[PDB]
Design an enzyme around this catalytic site. Structure first.
Site, PDB file in Angstrom:
ATOM      1  N   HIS A  50      -8.958  20.012  24.463  1.00 48.78           N
ATOM      2  CA  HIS A  50      -8.326  18.712  24.295  1.00 48.78           C
ATOM      3  C   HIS A  50      -6.832  18.884  24.465  1.00 48.78           C
ATOM      4  CE1 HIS A  50      -8.367  19.965  20.028  1.00 48.78           C
ATOM      5  NE2 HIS A  50      -7.321  19.171  19.874  1.00 48.78           N
ATOM      6  N   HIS A  54      -4.149  18.705  22.529  1.00 54.81           N
ATOM      7  CA  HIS A  54      -3.215  19.134  21.496  1.00 54.81           C
ATOM      8  C   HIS A  54      -2.647  20.526  21.800  1.00 54.81           C
ATOM      9  CE1 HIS A  54      -4.898  16.117  18.310  1.00 54.81           C
ATOM     10  NE2 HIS A  54      -4.042  15.554  19.143  1.00 54.81           N
ATOM     11  N   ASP A  78      -2.620  23.356  20.273  1.00 57.34           N
ATOM     12  CA  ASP A  78      -3.416  24.595  20.055  1.00 57.34           C
ATOM     13  C   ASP A  78      -4.420  24.806  21.187  1.00 57.34           C
ATOM     14  OD1 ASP A  78      -4.822  22.351  19.203  1.00 57.34           O
ATOM     15  OD2 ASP A  78      -5.729  23.329  17.492  1.00 57.34           O
ATOM     16  N   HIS A 100     -12.565  14.181  17.166  1.00 57.02           N
ATOM     17  CA  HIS A 100     -11.214  14.633  16.750  1.00 57.02           C
ATOM     18  C   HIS A 100     -10.165  14.003  17.688  1.00 57.02           C
ATOM     19  CE1 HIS A 100      -8.060  17.524  15.701  1.00 57.02           C
ATOM     20  NE2 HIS A 100      -7.899  17.652  17.024  1.00 57.02           N
ATOM     21  N   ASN A 122      -6.148  16.708  10.704  1.00 58.25           N
ATOM     22  CA  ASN A 122      -5.321  15.781  11.463  1.00 58.25           C
ATOM     23  C   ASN A 122      -6.241  14.810  12.186  1.00 58.25           C
ATOM     24  OD1 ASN A 122      -3.525  14.462  13.140  1.00 58.25           O
ATOM     25  ND2 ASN A 122      -3.299  16.206  14.532  1.00 58.25           N
TER      26      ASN A 122
HETATM   27  C1  LIG Z   1      -2.058  21.653  16.320  1.00 65.76           C
HETATM   28  C2  LIG Z   1      -3.387  21.220  15.706  1.00 65.76           C
HETATM   29  C3  LIG Z   1      -4.185  20.452  16.751  1.00 65.76           C
HETATM   30  S1  LIG Z   1      -5.908  20.172  16.259  1.00 65.76           S
HETATM   31  C4  LIG Z   1      -3.113  20.334  14.508  1.00 65.76           C
HETATM   32  O1  LIG Z   1      -3.086  19.117  14.600  1.00 65.76           O
HETATM   33  N1  LIG Z   1      -2.895  20.926  13.325  1.00 65.76           N
HETATM   34  C5  LIG Z   1      -2.857  22.365  13.030  1.00 65.76           C
HETATM   35  C6  LIG Z   1      -2.131  22.412  11.708  1.00 65.76           C
HETATM   36  C7  LIG Z   1      -2.558  21.145  11.006  1.00 65.76           C
HETATM   37  C8  LIG Z   1      -2.651  20.106  12.130  1.00 65.76           C
HETATM   38  C9  LIG Z   1      -1.353  19.300  12.216  1.00 65.76           C
HETATM   39  O2  LIG Z   1      -0.472  19.731  12.926  1.00 65.76           O
HETATM   40  O3  LIG Z   1      -1.299  18.274  11.568  1.00 65.76           O
HETATM   41 ZN   LIG Z   2      -6.463  18.804  17.941  1.00 61.28          ZN
HETATM   42 ZN   LIG Z   3      -6.990  22.207  16.518  1.00 60.03          ZN
END
Ligand SMILES: C[C@H](CS)C(=O)N1CCC[C@H]1C(=O)O
Ligand SMILES: [Zn+2]
Ligand SMILES: [Zn+2]
Ligand SMILES: [Zn+2]
Length: 232
Positions: A83, A85, A87, A148, A179
């Site tokens: 996806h 994001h 990561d 998600h 998230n």
């Molecule tokens: C970068 C990832 C993508 S699934 C994320 O949203 N995280 C990882 C840490 C928690 C949460 C956030 O940033 O709110």
């Molecule tokens: Zn994500």
């Molecule tokens: Zn993630």
């Protein structure tokens, strides 16, 4: 034996052999003062490697490639981001500079561009409708519907019975929603049920973050998503 944050220094990546020709990669990054792990996948593709997801950022992804080179010694020729994001696409420029062909669906590429994130070069057609599946070498890519994120893909390795759910699937230790800013809470359970229906033979289920388990992770995620949906 699965790697956790305490075993992974800042900026480093660990590999974990799940089955023959299948590894997960685990990296970490800090968010709001807490340390989170993140998983991706590596699938042997003949004498080449298919990478599923970056290691969450350019530094981690450079470390990912060095660790793959050191520990497996086969070229990473293609990568799929599941996806939009960071990561999943953060580190796509490092992959591109290293000769890796980076792929994502047009849905992910579109959302990454809107967000100002890195954009995989190649487009994966045939995944825009919920329930669509396409073969990609040693894996099947499946778009289960929005969960998600609206573009989230899951990855199945049929030779190893490994289902990689990405961030659409939560680990058991996560008992509240993470998230959900980009999520479709209303459709997430239905999307999970499509995964369950298509891969009922899955033996290993990898969440985007945390410890692998079995298919129970699907119902777990549905439980957590439904509880969050009913927050009052
Ligand atoms: C970068 C990832 C993508 S699934 C994320 O949203 N995280 C990882 C840490 C928690 C949460 C956030 O940033 O709110
Ligand atoms: Zn994500
Ligand atoms: Zn993630
Ligand atoms: Zn549970």
């Amino acid at each position: 034996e699965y790697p956790t944050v305490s075993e992974i220094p800042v900026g480093e990546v660990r590999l974990y052999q799940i089955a023959d020709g299948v590894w997960s990669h685990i990296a970490t990054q800090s968010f709001d003062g807490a340390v989170y792990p993140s998983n991706g996948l590596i699938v042997r593709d003949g004498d080449e490697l298919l990478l599923i997801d970056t290691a969450w950022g350019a530094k981690n992804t450079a470390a990912l490639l060095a660790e793959i080179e050191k520990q497996i010694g086969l070229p990473v020729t293609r990568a799929v981001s599941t996806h939009f994001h960071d990561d999943r696409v953060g580190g796509v420029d490092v992959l591109r500079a290293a000769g890796v062909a980076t792929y994502a669906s047009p849905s992910t590429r579109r959302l990454a561009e809107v967000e100002g994130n890195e954009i995989p070069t190649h487009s994966l057609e045939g995944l825009s409708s919920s329930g669509d599946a396409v073969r990609f070498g040693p894996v099947e890519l499946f778009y289960p519907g929005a969960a998600h994120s609206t573009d989230n893909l899951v990855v199945y390795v049929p030779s190893a019975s490994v289902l990689y759910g990405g961030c659409a699937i939560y680990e058991l230790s996560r008992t509240s929603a993470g998230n959900v800013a980009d999520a479709d809470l209303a459709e997430w359970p239905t999307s999970i049920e499509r995964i369950q229906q298509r891969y009922p033979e899955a033996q290993f289920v990898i969440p985007g973050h945390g410890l692998p388990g079995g298919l129970d992770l699907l119902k777990h995620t549905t439980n957590v998503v439904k509880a969050h949906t009913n927050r009052s």
